[PDB]
Amino acid sequence: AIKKAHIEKDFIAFCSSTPDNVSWRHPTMGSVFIGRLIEHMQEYACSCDVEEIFRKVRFSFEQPAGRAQMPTTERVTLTRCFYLFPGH
Amino acid sequence: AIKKAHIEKDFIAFCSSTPDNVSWRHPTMGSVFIGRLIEHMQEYACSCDVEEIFRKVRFSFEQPAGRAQMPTTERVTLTRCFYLFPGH
Amino acid sequence: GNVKLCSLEEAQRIWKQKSAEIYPIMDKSSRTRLALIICNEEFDSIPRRTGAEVDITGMTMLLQNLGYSVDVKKNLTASDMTTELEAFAHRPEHKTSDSTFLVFMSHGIREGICGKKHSEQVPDILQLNAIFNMLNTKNCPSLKDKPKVIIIQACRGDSPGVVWFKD
Amino acid sequence: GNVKLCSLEEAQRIWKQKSAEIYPIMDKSSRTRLALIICNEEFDSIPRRTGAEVDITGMTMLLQNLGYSVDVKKNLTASDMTTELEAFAHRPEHKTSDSTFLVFMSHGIREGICGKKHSEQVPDILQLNAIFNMLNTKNCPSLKDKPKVIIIQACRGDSPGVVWFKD
Amino acid sequence: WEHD
Amino acid sequence: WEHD
Numbered sequence: 279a280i281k282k283a284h285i286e287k288d289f290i291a292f293c294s295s296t297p298d299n300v301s302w303r304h305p306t307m308g309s310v311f312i313g314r315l316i317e318h319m320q321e322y323a324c325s326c327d328v329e330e331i332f333r334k335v336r337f338s339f340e341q342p343a344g345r346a347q348m349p350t351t352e353r354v355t356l357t358r359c360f361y362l363f364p365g366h
Numbered sequence: 367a368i369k370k371a372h373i374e375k376d377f378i379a380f381c382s383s384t385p386d387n388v389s390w391r392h393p394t395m396g397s398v399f400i401g402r403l404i405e406h407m408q409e410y411a412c413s414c415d416v417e418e419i420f421r422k423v424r425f426s427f428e429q430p431a432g433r434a435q436m437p438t439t440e441r442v443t444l445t446r447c448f449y450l451f452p453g454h
Numbered sequence: 455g456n457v458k459l460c461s462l463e464e465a466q467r468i469w470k471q472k473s474a475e476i477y478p479i480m481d482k483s484s485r486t487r488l489a490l491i492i493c494n495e496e497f498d499s500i501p502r503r504t505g506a507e508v509d510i511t512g513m514t515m516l517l518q519n520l521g522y523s524v525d526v527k528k529n530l531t532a533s534d535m536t537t538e539l540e541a542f543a544h545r546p547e548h549k550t551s552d553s554t555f556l557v558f559m560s561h562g563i564r565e566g567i568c569g570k571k572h573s574e575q576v577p578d579i580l581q582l583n584a585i586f587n588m589l590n591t592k593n594c595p596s597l598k599d600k601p602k603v604i605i606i607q608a609c610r611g612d613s614p615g616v617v618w619f620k621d
Numbered sequence: 622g623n624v625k626l627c628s629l630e631e632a633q634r635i636w637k638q639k640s641a642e643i644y645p646i647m648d649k650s651s652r653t654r655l656a657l658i659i660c661n662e663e664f665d666s667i668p669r670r671t672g673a674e675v676d677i678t679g680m681t682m683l684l685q686n687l688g689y690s691v692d693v694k695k696n697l698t699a700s701d702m703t704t705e706l707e708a709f710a711h712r713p714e715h716k717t718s719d720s721t722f723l724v725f726m727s728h729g730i731r732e733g734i735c736g737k738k739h740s741e742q743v744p745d746i747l748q749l750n751a752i753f754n755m756l757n758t759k760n761c762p763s764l765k766d767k768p769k770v771i772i773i774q775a776c777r778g779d780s781p782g783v784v785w786f787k788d
Numbered sequence: 789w790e791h792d
Numbered sequence: 793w794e795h796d
Contacts, residue, residue, distance in 0.1 A: 283619050287765075290769070291773065296375075311774055324624075355384065357421065363627050364688075371591050377603075384615060416601070444601065447475060454465070670796065
């Protein structure tokens with residue numbers, strides 16, 4: 279037979295900056311957002327769910343290092359924690 | 367002297383539905399989103415941070431009860447967990 | 455009241471596990487927390503939002519038990535909402551608050567919240583980014599580094615939000 | 622590889638604490654995880670995004686070590702991006718995947734991501750809601766009930782994002 | 789039930 | 793450093 283399902287669900291965007299604002303990039307270091315997302319990913323993917331890891335990223339941009347930037351998490355419809363259980 | 371600060375930070379929206387979609391309401395029961403936000407708030411405010419509580423709300427809308435609805439968390443810039451430590 | 459209270463023991467356990475990444479809380483004796491509820495039940499050209507009265511009663515009690523002074527506003531126009539917001543952003547109580555809760559309830563479309571005098575041919579909506587704009591560090595420094603939780607109960611369009619699948 | 626691995630013991634501890642609210646994981650032997658990286662370094666009327674090459678190298682290795690097959694696409698136009706997305710949404714590997722990662726990197730404005738042939742007077746941008754639209758339950762049922770993480774590295778305008786305060 |  |  280047929281059943282109804284939610285048209286939009288289990289999504290989660292993570293932008294390098296907040297609306298109206300720019301994001302930084304270095305010719306030999308790449309984007310700060312990226313290098314940092316990676317750094318945190320490599321570090322906490324084993325114990326923290328994605329949402330938490332994203333927060334931890336925002337937190338590292340908390341003290342404005344001149345090249346100020348504030349990463350935003352948007353349109354979140356994750357109804358559960360998403361751990362990446364790296365290693366399997 | 368003067369220091370720079372982030373123009374946008376520590377925000378967090380929580381909408382009753384996803385974009386393009388409606389939300390439900392009952393004449394003698396009010397909005398489901400609301401009654402449910404409250405229910406969860408009363409229950410987990412003591413042990414879970416706001417973000418987590420919001421997720422738990424989305425999760426209760428996971429199985430489409432005819433009057434389907436999916437709550438979205440948006441423009442999140444919370445760099446830390448926000449526990450409401452009710453009771454003090 | 456009806457909110458399950460946090461026991462001193464568990465509070466410090468929570469306070470211990472990850473103190474460095476928690477928004478600081480202000481002492482119960484001195485803080486003056488503010489919360490704003492804007493609800494539109496009566497409309498000039500749209501079906502009345504019957505049931506709002508219960509949502510209002512609901513949120514208000516909740517916020518209060520959470521430690522917030524709740525200012526309630528009913529049936530406003532975008533203009534009025536934009537004004538009330540500028541007012542709330544200027545309130546002196548925020549200087550001694552640790553967070554804030556904004557709650558909107560009314561009909562809505564994909565672009566924003568519907569004000570009382572809204573019609574198909576003549577708009578009266580509050581763009582969502584405007585709320586975020588009026589409460590940021592520039593327009594409301596009293597709340598810098600403090601939680602600003604916006605809760606919205608409004609339609610985001612007309613679609614019923616579902617698709618069918620076979621089984 | 623460089624990712625700190627999750628030990629069986631802690632994995633089950635995590636699996637124990639709140640099993641009911643975790644997205645299910647598919648067995649390592651059978652799953653075919655897909656990930657898509659769209660990066661625009663070369664532009665026809667905007668300064669080259671020097672440094673992209675390092676971001677690409679960065680994300681790709683990461684995703685792979687996370688267990689994802691990474692498909693990389695460079696310097697596309699909104700059209701091309703919209704096409705590649707429809708393609709990715711139709712890939713058969715998703716049927717046997719448990720989540721997916723989409724990564725965009727390029728200049729951008731407040732409304733969307735910039736495509737290769739973008740200019741001030743003649744737009745070439747991919748509206749953000751379009752990405753969410755093409756990967757939802759209707760246009761991509763293979764991913765229903767599965768994590769869809771979009772990561773975007775792009776400017777959202779021209780403002781420098783800061784305000785001054787006295788001290 | 790109605791639409792909000 | 794540049795603007796993205």
